[PDB]
Design a protein around this ligand. Structure first.
Ligand SMILES: [Zn+2]
Ligand SMILES: [Zn+2]
Ligand SMILES: [Zn+2]
Ligand SMILES: [Zn+2]
Lengths: 385, 385
């Protein structure tokens, strides 16, 4: 097997790249190519040929169950061996990552770009028929919810043929022809266009100029705020009023929960007053306060309200689990700060990972004294007050 | 207690700030001020007054043994309460952090700037007498080895009076008068000036324009390479020849260790061929490959030599401990990748945290498939090849 590389595009999906490789190298379709590629890897005894996928919908390493590192080893070998000139193959693939988006969503990565798993499309993947016909390849952005309009042609992406059959370019090809009726697939909220342009990485006021992974983070965050599908209109609205618009969400959240508080003030946990908002904002995907503007604003608000109302904020209860996520440290690290005299529990008996033994004020001052990094530190939000 | 804030300087040491506060608010010296400050905190019953320091050499939170978070709570309260206008106090303090510089050095942080603990001066702290007399305050940079020349006056910092008594501005004051002989303290390698200027944060060719924490990281790294005090001349030399100068260090390291190899090739561990260099370079202080240019070059070299010599590099042995530092993951995470079928050990019995069960090639492909972040990823070094 020896292949001509197609014209490289840095925004091409991995599936589109393989489709073009198949088309331009005389294979009948991508499936025949993937089967021939698996046979090639078997003929050179590359460990991992057994799990090489022949289903174009399962090609990315995130789709591998147990063989994700055999998959990346395979792409590396193919890149380094089977082309006249080596293509960028690994850089187009969507891999799993270790990162999380708060509170508990997993994530994936392509190149240097991290995405919440909640945004990774599970079923049919849409397309822009204008992009396919004019460019001859598919964008990786079509794999991710939130990107609902083509930022270059300013029209909504298309999911289904007018005949009713869903059009997935991965299965039906880059020519944009419906598999069932054999007709060419054929086609304006500016807010949708604004956030699509922003997601693509371009300046789009009033949305903030953050690294790409944190833009996807804000989409995930907004979804959680509303507990529903991403609403482009209220998102743009929100940022057109930033940061006051967020100061109102915080204040309104505290005042509602404090009033609906049925337990004693001394028994109030941080989760009871600011649960959703605080623990939903810590990793978007990380705690870099130049980039995680939600956490920066929240922490600036909390430092400056710390000791008001005889320590309302400072006294809010937390457990060891919550402190570890706050501080980005291990439970074992927490135990060592409590057995020594650095972290002091409220109830002085003589560590339940889950009992609410600590006070926000103590954990906050512990962060300052022991857990600031070059990215996650007070100096990056003091200008927000 | 009510105080006038001194003229703020963003580069002032915490000790110098307190000295000026004492001088300008009628206290006899800084010690009397710190004692009065401790009495003030006791009069308002601030928890932490008992550990408030009265030794100017022990004022930073890093000098607290068990009370570092009482110390930051104290600074916060003092800032928010005892001045006509609130000063930036916390931002001048040197705190401990959780970060490490490879292989096992601890770190501290001031503002957003992280430093290796190995550079934090333990004994007498030097000064520039020109800075003291012209500016009336001391720079925080004087606390850190590597910064041996004043970058603004282009002269070496001074440690001891001509009479022999060491001059520590913290104890002897900002007036630059020797405590023993009562004489004013009185005073040219351009490489020293170059790296001093670079450490201060300014452009200084041929040294690389990285965030400050990674500049201190390179000083720590160079010290380890030579196993001795920082040598400004060979450091500048090294970077005047970058990156070829590092390609030579790698190649020379591999060829020496491979030749001095007494064990069988199949038994070669990664540590045996590239021990010092690889595990000395992972966290400087982190794995961001835009900033940790040592790790980026090393990983680019390793990916592209992976499968040469019938997998010399790929076959190098590693244990679970080494993989966790490589991958930035937990030992428990490693166990879950081996009990599942993602990470495959070499010897197939049926996890010793220390046995060399894994191959570099497997761990490297696992990093790609499962552990790339927005900062620690292949796309940030492919341009180095
Ligand atoms: Zn389009
Ligand atoms: Zn149709
Ligand atoms: Zn000077
Ligand atoms: Zn003297």
């Amino acid at each position: 097997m020896f292949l001509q590389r197609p014209k490289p595009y840095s925004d091409e999906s991995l599936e589109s790249f393989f489709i073009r490789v198949a088309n331009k190298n005389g294979y009948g379709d991508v499936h025949r190519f993937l089967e021939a590629t698996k046979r090639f890897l078997q003929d050179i005894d590359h460990n991992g040929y057994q799990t090489f996928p022949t289903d174009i919908t399962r090609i990315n390493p995130y789709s591998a169950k147990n063989s994700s590192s055999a998959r990346t080893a395979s792409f590396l070998k193919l890149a380094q061996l089977t082309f006249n000139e080596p293509p960028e193959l690994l850089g187009l693939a969507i891999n799993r990552t270790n990162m999380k988006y708060s509170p508990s969503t997993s994530a994936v990565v392509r190149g240097a770009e991290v995405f919440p798993r909640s945004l990774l499309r599970t079923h049919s993947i849409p397309c822009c028929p204008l992009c396919l016909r004019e460019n001859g390849y598919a964008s990786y952005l079509w794999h991710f919810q939130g990107y609902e309009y083509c930022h270059s042609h300013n029209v909504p992406l298309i999911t289904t043929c007018s005949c009713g059959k869903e059009f997935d370019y991965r299965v039906s090809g880059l020519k944009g022809i419906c598999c069932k009726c054999k007709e060419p697939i054929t086609l304006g909220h500016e807010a949708a266009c604004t956030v699509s342009n922003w997601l693509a990485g371009h300046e789009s006021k009033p949305l903030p100029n953050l690294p790409k992974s944190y833009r996807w983070g804000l989409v995930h965050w907004w979804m959680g705020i509303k507990d529903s599908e991403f609403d482009h209109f209220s998102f743009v609205q929100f940022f057109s009023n930033w940061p006051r618009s967020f100061h109102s969400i915080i204040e309104d959240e505290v005042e509602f929960n404090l009033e609906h508080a049925v337990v004693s003030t001394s028994e109030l946990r941080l989760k009871d007053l600011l649960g959703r908002l605080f623990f939903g904002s810590i990793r978007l995907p990380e705690r870099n306060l130049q980039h995680n503007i939600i956490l920066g604003e929240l922490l600036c608000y909390l430092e400056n309200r710390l000791w008001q109302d005889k320590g309302l904020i400072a006294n809010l209860k937390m457990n060891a689990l919550e402190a570890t996520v706050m501080l980005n440290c291990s439970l074992d690290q927490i135990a060592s700060m409590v057995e020594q005299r650095i972290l002091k529990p409220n109830r002085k008996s003589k560590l339940d990972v889950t009992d609410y033994l600590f006070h926000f004020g103590d954990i906050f001052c512990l962060w300052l004294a022991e857990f600031q990094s070059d990215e996650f530190n007070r100096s990056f939000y003091v200008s927000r007050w």
